[PDB]
Design a protein around this ligand. Structure first.
Ligand code: UDP
Ligand code: UDP
Ligand code: UDP
Ligand code: UDP
Ligand code: UDP
Ligand code: UDP
Ligand code: MN
Ligand code: MN
Ligand code: MN
Ligand code: MN
Ligand code: MN
Ligand code: MN
Lengths: 545, 545, 545
């Protein structure tokens, strides 16, 4: 019986793979707290010093993210991000690609560990020939208990797709990985072969990767057990249907169109796959994203477009004070509708984020209304996470990230008697709040039957007026959970309305005092009247009235 | 807000429903230990004294069956049976119908309770008119915590199908319930309406039944929550597909053919339903049932036919000593192949149960070979349970119910050094045994490549020779778990081979001693070489060598 | 490293131990479901055929008792009893001694297994010399995972006390094991050595017993770990205090007094041990046992004395119809007070069981009033279990075993509308009932402030009147859980009041109808007003009013 010691001896015996561009290794973690620390330790022991480790957590329920954050704090080579919703391993891979900075991209699962010479040999093979575009090395299956080799199809090690590494420019020419639960690695490899060519891919018959064999994994549907050291891997019915789906799609679609087909981030499936094969939100109604922008943050706005030009079906951009329409907005074409009020006296500032909503009231077009601010950096999984949370709450309540909770006895809105859960600050559990910041508000349009923008008497107070509108229709506001620094604020030394109205909040205080009650008195009746809000019931609501 | 006290007041206010044939109330229990005792107490409090309560347990993982057995021991009106595999509520209902003795059949779920005057009123309405064939009464949804009414479609109580009660002769004219996970009650009600007529069904607008609203139930797919007292019930996509499936089937099939279409017990779906809608085994290969019979137990054989004439695709009956072919065997037609050796000297007795197996070796026809004895009463879920257990073990081992475990140092086969787990005795957990009784052996035919009946030198020792054949091919024998008295032995004062060879087991002892090793020494290598057998590893195998 | 295979080889190599009196092996089980089946299998494989296996379950919370009952049903050599309260291993050993029938007694823990030749060799050594009174054999510690030997004090096997076996007459001359949690085996062995002599004990230096080393066991307080194969066993502070306690007690007490010091069953500690070393009830108030007896069951009464003459501080026996005081009652002396009303017309029958209670009302003597009937066989742990249950409920409610639950709409007491949980029938969970049978009622005297026997107008209806008294003072009646056949009824073809008043219950029906309400209407207010009764809240009490 061949063991992993034999694999290491064979790797050391072979001389294959023997400037230094930055290499980004992207790890995907999901409830793998037992193995992620070992995986990161194995990645940090690589002989290729000029590396960085981008780790993406697919909304783990265990302390995987805590271990990843601790290791990222120990050393500067590890940068860790967490997805607030479970979207599969390939969405995390694409997010890591977006967050990466190196010219070469490699992959490694969190539950698996790699040889301490994998990246060096793979980079040497990749850069040996200029025309080479990608390199892959053989992997193997191991039992974590006995450390023996789980032979697959009567072979110790076989060429795989998780070990495939390529240049950074590959993902900007043929798109990114297809956002599916499983089987997207084969599709991406075949896409590379169709676009560049089979001669552009290098193969390294060395067991440089070690897939840990654990139960209830993604590929267990392909496993037929013969004994403790031999398994048979055959594609399932859904996997075969997916495989036949894209092979015909590769032939029926031009290669240069691939960049226009698999754009990331995305919220719709690029291929007709069943629900059990895709973990994307896949909304059944059009998605509208509304955002207001001032010129002083125009560059930030561009970045938002670079993260939201594909995560919606329609845009509503309110340019407040702009002189001319920016190029990145007019490039969207009919997808974006722009409000270009050039007068500050007649301007409505943040209230423009609700303009399209009024039109939907006159059209009864169901959708997922999203409101965003131009000073917030949004992640690649923001829209999918918001839609998933809305579906989890059955679209019966408005959700947000910037939560504000104040009692009904408060005499000053910006006093110390309010509690603020910022969008860039972590939240362990979902909490119902009185006021949600409109920069992170997502809600289904069908929740509101009648709405008019003229009810928003004062500009710059969108949060208070939106909370009043939600309270009038008895619609709950939920501050959903999120990891630390999920939405990193980017002020960039600009002017903010918080600094302007922090010491001059007379109108906000008047509205809060005149439109009570607040606190849990406005939450407990709404949270006690629905089973889906049972986990959101306040613990001791007798003081926070 | 209407409460259950208002429902009881309305029931007491209405005078509707005011000889005594035996009435059988059939309860289906599955992980409802918190409510089954209350349900049985409610059924025992009915004013209709001449009742019996047939309870069927759908392989509960909690102590539901223990409570049911205790209550059945307390009083003679309760008879409890347990299905060894989970086959849905309607399979349990049909099993209760088969086990019932009353002329009128009523139903009540284990998680629900009924008014103490439901059965009396329903029977009075049913027997008020001679032409009446079935009666149903309105039900309601209740929250177990607050005891309030969960209104469905803005109505306090609505007519249902679980409360439908009919005569015993109904199930023998249009078949039984369709063996599906859910939605079969509507299909059965529409079948009754199509066959007899809408005028033959009586409706009682009284809340005589109380469906407890608990999470993760079967009908939660139809529930859309509005508040804590109002829900909307709409059929899902799969439910709608099933509903459209049988409505056309009712029109496209003659009424008198229904008896030939929904025969129970069955192992194949009568309608093209998806896997998520049917909990039957649904084998992809033909099922062969093999049985030997002597004339002295001929009546018992008939009963076996009455429970197995539809649970297979082919029969192999070995008539040992019979004078003429019985009517109930020749009525099967080409479905049954009969071996009618009339000479006792040339007879092979139980070895005939393997004759068809040899033919399959010459034909390579994959299937589920089942061996049965004529002195054992089999339940309605026997074949489905065996196939489900085989699929759980991935068809990699032979399963049985009569287990025999003896050490390798044994000097007499029928001595006190062997441990016997009889088929009529309960077993808490699956255990791998050395010898499985051939009267309860089920195995996939593909596990054996070469087999000849001539290897069975001596007759009446089928268990030992079959165990030797399994050990030669390294095929594990597993004594699966079963409840108490799952297979009630029916000797009926006949002659048994155990009494004949108990004091004259020279050949069996010779074979056991000559074909070692036995005990865990013949089990531990087989149980340590497969993950699916991990739960079957012996605890302390150092003494049982 | 020595292994268990070496131990078996050494046992087979040694010839030591090579009529057949009945030998009873007593097993104690407590949450050892993983090993009890293996232990019983090892005991059934012993070469000494003439054996019986008495198993006592120390109120296991897992399915240990289910496995034991199944194995006891498989073969006639296994008899299983369950203690309803946890009283330690030595109380179970003494109960097994009382229930045993053999002339020789051996012991074996449920978590441990023995060699298949231990009992034969031990019996041969014991009966080799007539003057021999007990034999012990060396034991060893084993790891259940690796099956290696856990050396204790740098020795593979050492002489122990669990393996000690002796004659049946030993326990009737020097009493039984001291009812402590641990360390009582050493005390019993030293007691035997002090009484008979060191020459009367035989030692067998053979590893015939295998103590499984599992965490959180009783002797883990003595274990200091050095490595995976070596431990150090040293007595703890409490163990040393207990050891010094009885060694002086052996010298300061006459040998013939031992029989009068360690009588079993008992409810008080024979030695001043701390609470953490004794699992007995140890009441702080005198215990009074009250029982009525008719001559037709006089022999049964004697048996009750044989099980209750030491489980109390005072007796109150009401002889109804007796001619002369029986010898076994007058032998108790001042411990028993007898009421000898010779007139049937002036007799009160079962009401005499409360006579002493009235006296306590005139004396304010706190205690644990116990009422018993002469037709019920009581176990050796009955009083301890009742006192433990009362302490668990903080002495705030009356407990019993014969529970009766009927609705408030019942028009006949002995009709089919009542539910009876008999004392000889199992109950999975404690249930509050309307009426508790006075033959199994245990309650603290301080719960009642004023009581007069004249309130019991009619004789033979003690249950109804006692339930009325409990309801008047708002004292809950709880039918505690018990295993199957915990109290085996012994009618012995006598006359019972149930048969007399089954068809003539006019007075009982009148009292029940005149002293309502009943059912959960009389239980829910009492069960909702105390946290200790939270687990006793009815599930769906809206029908059982
Ligand atoms: O829904 C999921 C399942 C898995 N993973 C991660 O994706 C990687 C690959 O999944 P898995 O280990 O199941 O792959 P396999 O070992 O089955 O090939 C692992 O790091 C998982 O933590 C994920 O992000 N989302
Ligand atoms: O005159 C203005 C100032 C701001 N904004 C927009 O209003 C939103 C909220 O402003 P800000 O970030 O200052 O609010 P804060 O986060 O300070 O509460 C942002 O999208 C700004 O682009 C606007 O439309 N007009
Ligand atoms: O797989 C299952 C699910 C449920 N049941 C039983 O069938 C009855 C009806 O199911 P359920 O209570 O879910 O029905 P609902 O209340 O959802 O209408 C209950 O007694 C369940 O214990 C069953 O036998 N098998
Ligand atoms: O001469 C005989 C006696 C019995 N049998 C069949 O062999 C099986 C096993 O026989 P039996 O029930 O006596 O076996 P036991 O249960 O006593 O071991 C049954 O199906 C019998 O019908 C048979 O074919 N020929
Ligand atoms: O409170 C208890 C603890 C243990 N035991 C049983 O008494 C025996 C001896 O206890 P243990 O196994 O802990 O002894 P050790 O192995 O520690 O010497 C076992 O069969 C236990 O199940 C018992 O009856 N009551
Ligand atoms: O004339 C009588 C009949 C009975 N008993 C006692 O009353 C108790 C209950 O009687 P029984 O067992 O007949 O009651 P059942 O169990 O039938 O309800 C027993 O201790 C009997 O000894 C009595 O004192 N006098
Ligand atoms: Mn993996
Ligand atoms: Mn801002
Ligand atoms: Mn239900
Ligand atoms: Mn038989
Ligand atoms: Mn032990
Ligand atoms: Mn009695």
């Amino acid at each position: 019986t061949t063991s992993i010691t034999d694999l290491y001896n064979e790797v050391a015996k072979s001389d294959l793979g023997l400037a230094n561009p930055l290499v980004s290794i992207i790890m995907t973690s999901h409830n793998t707290a037992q193995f992620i620390e070992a995986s990161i330790n194995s990645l940090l022991l690589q002989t290729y010093k000029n590396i960085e480790i981008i780790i993406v957590d697919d909304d783990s329920s265990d302390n995987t993210f805590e271990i990843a954050s601790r290791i990222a704090n120990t050393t500067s080579k590890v940068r860790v991000f967490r997805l607030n919703s479970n979207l599969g391993t390939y969405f995390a891979k694409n997010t890591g690609i977006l967050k990466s900075k190196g010219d070469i991209i490699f992959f490694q699962d969190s539950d698996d560990v790699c040889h301490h010479e994998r990246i060096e040999r793979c980079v040497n093979i990749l850069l040996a020939n200029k025309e080479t575009i990608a390199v892959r090395c053989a992997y193997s299956r191991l039992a974590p208990e006995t450390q023996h080799i789980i032979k697959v199809n009567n072979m110790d090690y076989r060429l795989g797709f998780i070990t495939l590494g390529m240049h950074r420019k590959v993902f900007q020419e043929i798109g990114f990985f297809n956002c599916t639960t499983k089987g997207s690695d084969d599709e991406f490899f075949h896409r590379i072969a169709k676009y560049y060519g089979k001669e552009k891919i290098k193969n390294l018959l060395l067991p440089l990767y070690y897939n840990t064999m654990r139960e209830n994994s993604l590929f267990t549907d392909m496993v037929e057990w013969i004994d403790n050291h031999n398994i048979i891997q055959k594609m399932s019915d859904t996997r075969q249907h997916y495989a036949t789906l894209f092979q015909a799609m590769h032939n029926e679609t031009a290669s240069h169109d691939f960049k226009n087909l698999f754009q990331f981030p995305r919220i719709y499936d690029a291929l007709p796959v069943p629900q059990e094969m895709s973990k994307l939100s896949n909304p059944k109604i059009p998605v509208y994203i509304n955002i207001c922008s001032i010129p002083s943050r125009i560059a930030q706005l561009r970045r938002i477009i670079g993260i939201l030009k594909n995560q919606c079906d329609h845009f509503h951009i309110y340019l407040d004070g702009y002189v001319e329409i920016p190029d990145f907005i007019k490039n969207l074409g009919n997808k974006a509708t722009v409000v270009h009020c050039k007068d500050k006296d007649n301007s409505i500032r943040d209230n423009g984020k609700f303009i399209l909503l009024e039109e939907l009231i006159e059209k009864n077009q169901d959708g997922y209304y999203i409101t965003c601010d131009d000073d917030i950096i949004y992640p690649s999984d923001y829209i999918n996470t918001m839609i998933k949370k809305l579906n989890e709450y059955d679209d019966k309540a408005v959700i947000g990230l910037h939560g504000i909770l104040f009692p009904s006895r408060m005499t000053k809105y910006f006093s110390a008697d309010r509690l603020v859960y910022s969008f860039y600050k972590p939240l362990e559990k979902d909490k119902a709040v009185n006021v949600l910041g409109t920069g992170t508000v997502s809600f289904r349009v069908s929740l509101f039957n009648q709405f008019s923008l003229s009810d928003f008497t004062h500009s710059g107070m969108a949060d208070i007026y939106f909370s009043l509108l939600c309270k009038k229709n008895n619609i709950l506001q939920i501050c959903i959970s999120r990891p630390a620094n999920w939405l990193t604020e980017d002020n960039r030394d600009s002017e903010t309305l918080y600094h302007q109205y922090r010491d001059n909040d007379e109108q906000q205080t008047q509205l809060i005092m005149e439109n009570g009650p607040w606190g849990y008195s406005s939450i407990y009746p709404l949270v006690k009247n629905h089973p889906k809000f049972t986990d959101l019931i306040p613990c001791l609501p007798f003081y926070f009235l």
